Design an enzyme around this catalytic site. Structure first.
Site, PDB file in Angstrom:
ATOM      1  N   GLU A 175      -4.521  -3.704  -7.414  1.00 11.26           N
ATOM      2  CA  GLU A 175      -4.993  -2.714  -6.460  1.00 11.26           C
ATOM      3  C   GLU A 175      -3.924  -2.240  -5.496  1.00 11.26           C
ATOM      4  O   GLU A 175      -4.173  -1.273  -4.766  1.00 11.26           O
ATOM      5  CB  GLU A 175      -6.188  -3.259  -5.657  1.00 11.26           C
ATOM      6  CG  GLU A 175      -7.462  -3.398  -6.491  1.00 11.26           C
ATOM      7  CD  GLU A 175      -8.679  -3.810  -5.669  1.00 11.26           C
ATOM      8  OE1 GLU A 175      -8.529  -3.974  -4.440  1.00 11.26           O
ATOM      9  OE2 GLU A 175      -9.782  -3.970  -6.252  1.00 11.26           O
ATOM     10  N   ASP A 227      -7.974   8.432   2.029  1.00 12.54           N
ATOM     11  CA  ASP A 227      -8.069   8.942   0.666  1.00 12.54           C
ATOM     12  C   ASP A 227      -8.798  10.285   0.643  1.00 12.54           C
ATOM     13  O   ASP A 227      -9.274  10.789   1.666  1.00 12.54           O
ATOM     14  CB  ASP A 227      -8.736   7.918  -0.257  1.00 12.54           C
ATOM     15  CG  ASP A 227     -10.203   7.621   0.096  1.00 12.54           C
ATOM     16  OD1 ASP A 227     -10.923   8.488   0.636  1.00 12.54           O
ATOM     17  OD2 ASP A 227     -10.648   6.490  -0.200  1.00 12.54           O
TER      18      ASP A 227
END
Lengths: 109, 174
Positions: B11, B20
């Site tokens: 990750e 994001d």
């Protein structure tokens, strides 16, 4: 914090208190100011926006102003529930992003 | 190799707060802070960022201003592991398999829980039963027959190898 405020102020209830913040032309000089409140042990919440507008659900006792590269938040009739950390926020066109103050603690005695 | 390096490999880890495309602020190893959302709306954007910074500072123990060290990211990740394990130990579908597993395979199960959530992992009924019964090869095959494997086949291959072997071989390669 690129914005600087006063550090701490202690006051009696029902007194007026005025927190101020100083910036530059890249931020407060050309962008509106928001005020954020954080009670002890709680999450920060929006107190004021657009220099002098009350955020939804915020008491009538708060007012705001901006002039030059400075801004201020005034609490009329200080209440026990107003003991908190107060942070200024604004947009900086040079940095191109959100800038904040270091916070001012108001303690109600 | 440990579970921290494992999840870092799968990750990544951010030392700076990142927002994001879905408006989520994130830092460290997939650690979600707040969700960002017309002048009032932008004021709520500044609020959301400040709330994220406030969560991060409270979790780390200092005023980070959005930037953390790798050790701080590890501390955050250890908190997230403890929370995930507590969830597992409250989950009637995941607790027995988790308790039956060894530490390395437990790391694989936690990895799945971090990627898909408790409910997503609990959906793998047959594969979890095969894990609890230590049928490693068959659990590996049936796990390969999943949407999870089709979407993220490299991570899924590494986790599946971990379940099948009970070793760190799929991660120690690089």
């Amino acid at each position: 914090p690129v914005l600087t405020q006063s550090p701490s102020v202690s006051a009696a209830p029902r007194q007026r208190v005025t927190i101020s913040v100083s910036g530059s032309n890249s931020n407060i000089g050309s962008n509106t100011v928001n005020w954020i409140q954080q009670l002890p042990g709680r999450a920060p919440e929006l107190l004021m926006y657009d220099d002098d507008l009350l955020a939804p659900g915020v008491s009538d006792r708060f007012s705001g102003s901006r002039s030059g590269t400075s801004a201020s938040l005034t609490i009329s009739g200080l209440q026990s529930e107003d003991e908190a950390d107060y942070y200024a926020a604004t947009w900086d066109d040079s940095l191109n992003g959100w800038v904040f103050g270091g916070g001012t603690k108001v303690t109600v005695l | 190799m440990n579970i921290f390096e494992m999840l870092r490999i799968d990750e990544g880890l951010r030392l700076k707060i990142y927002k994001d495309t879905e408006g989520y602020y994130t830092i460290g190893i997939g650690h979600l802070l707040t969700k960002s959302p017309e002048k009032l709306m932008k004021a709520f954007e500044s609020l959301s960022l400040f709330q994220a910074k406030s969560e991060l500072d409270k979790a780390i123990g200092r005023n980070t201003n959005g930037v953390i060290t790798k050790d701080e990211a590890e501390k955050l990740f250890n908190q997230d592991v403890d929370a995930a394990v507590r969830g597992i130990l409250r989950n009637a579908k995941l607790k027995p398999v988790y308790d039956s597993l060894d530490a390395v395979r437990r790391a694989a199960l936690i990895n799945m829980v971090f990627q898909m959530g408790e409910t997503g992992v609990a959906g793998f009924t047959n594969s979890l039963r095969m894990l609890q019964q230590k049928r490693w090869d068959e659990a590996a095959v049936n796990l390969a027959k999943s949407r999870w494997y089709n979407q993220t086949p490299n991570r899924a291959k590494r986790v599946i190898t971990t379940f099948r072997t009970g070793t760190w071989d799929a991660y120690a390669n690089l």
